[PDB]
From a paper:
The ligand-activated transcription factor farnesoid X receptor (FXR, NR1H4)1,2 acting as cellular sensor for bile acids is a crucial metabolic regulator and liver protector. As a member of the nuclear receptor (NR) superfamily it translates ligand signals into changes in gene expression and affects a variety of genes involved in bile acid, glucose and lipid metabolism. NRs share a common architecture of an N-terminal ligand-independent activation domain followed by a DNA-binding domain (DBD), a flexible hinge region and a ligand-binding domain composed of twelve α-helices (α1-α12).
Structurally, unliganded FXR-LBD comprises the α11 and L:α3-α4 regions in an unordered state and can bind the co-repressor. This indicates that the activation function α12 in case of FXR is not disordered and exposed to solvent but even in absence of a ligand is partially stabilised and part of the core LBD. In contrast to the initially proposed mouse trap mechanism and later refined models suggesting an unordered conformation of α12 in solution in absence of an agonist, our results indicate that α12 is ordered and forms part of the core LBD also in absence of a ligand. Still, it is possible that the apo-state has a very weak affinity to co-activators that is too low to be captured in our system.
Author numbering:
A (entry chain B): 740 to 752
B (entry chain A): 241 to 471
The structure:
């Protein structure tokens, strides 16, 4: 996906 | 009472401060500032490590801002990407001005000026650091200003700009009051803080040009930095 790493950090508790 | 936080504002302020104080620079990085070998290559790699940490810390600070996770998910990404450079420069200014010992700051500046980065972009960075330093902001003002930069309704690609504006306006009201509590003799203080956000926005262009210039031995950036800066 786009912005995969940022989305990983955003959705990681 | 035009200068006194209501109970809800004081709760909001504590909550932002808790989130702001939660993370700082890992000792691994501050240790490298002090004892790593000195070369343009080593210095550039420390600075990319610092930037990567800045992004990580900013995401965590932003996730804890009240209301942020109620926003549309694409707008959340749009805010994090849109604000990343301004928030990095604001954070790094505080770190340089207030969070490092003298000597750490001296060696970090020496490493910054000897990292293969052109003086075209280093000189405005240190000018801004001093310009921000002149305001002599408290930790509370720094934290609130940072949250105001992050929750900007004006970033590219925001779908629901009203929703962001609703989150940012209570922070501005709090900051207005903080300026009257902390610098009661300087009525222009809050306007001066917002005046510095104008200089802060010049670093979107400064950073974009820097990314186009040479990189010591043409070293690369971390995946996360490439992603947040659209490299």
């Amino acid at each position: 996906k786009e912005n995969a790493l940022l989305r990983y950090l955003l959705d990681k508790d | 009472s035009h200068m006194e936080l209501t109970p809800d504002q004081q709760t909001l302020l504590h909550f932002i401060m808790d989130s702001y104080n939660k993370q700082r620079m890992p000792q691994e990085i501050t240790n490298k500032i002090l004892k790593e070998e000195f070369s343009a290559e080593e210095n550039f790699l420390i600075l990319t490590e610092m930037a990567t940490n800045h992004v990580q810390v900013l995401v965590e600070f932003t996730k804890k801002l009240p209301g942020f996770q109620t926003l549309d998910h694409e707008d959340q990404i749009a805010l994090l990407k849109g604000s990343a450079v301004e928030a990095m420069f604001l954070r790094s200014a505080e770190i340089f001005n207030k969070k490092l010992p003298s000597g750490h700051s001296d060696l970090l500046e020496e490493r910054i000026r000897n990292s293969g980065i052109s003086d075209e972009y280093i000189t405005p960075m240190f000018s801004f650091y001093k310009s921000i330093g002149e305001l002599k902001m408290t930790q509370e003002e720094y934290a609130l200003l940072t949250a105001i930069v992050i929750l900007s309704p004006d970033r590219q690609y925001i779908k629901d700009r009203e929703a962001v504006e609703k989150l940012q306006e209570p922070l501005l009201d709090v900051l207005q009051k903080l300026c009257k509590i902390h610098q009661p003799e300087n009525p222009q203080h809050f306007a001066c803080l917002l005046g510095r956000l104008t200089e802060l926005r010049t670093f979107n262009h400064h950073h974009a040009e820097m990314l186009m210039s040479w990189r010591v031995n043409d070293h690369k950036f971390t995946p996360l930095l490439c992603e947040i800066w659209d490299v």
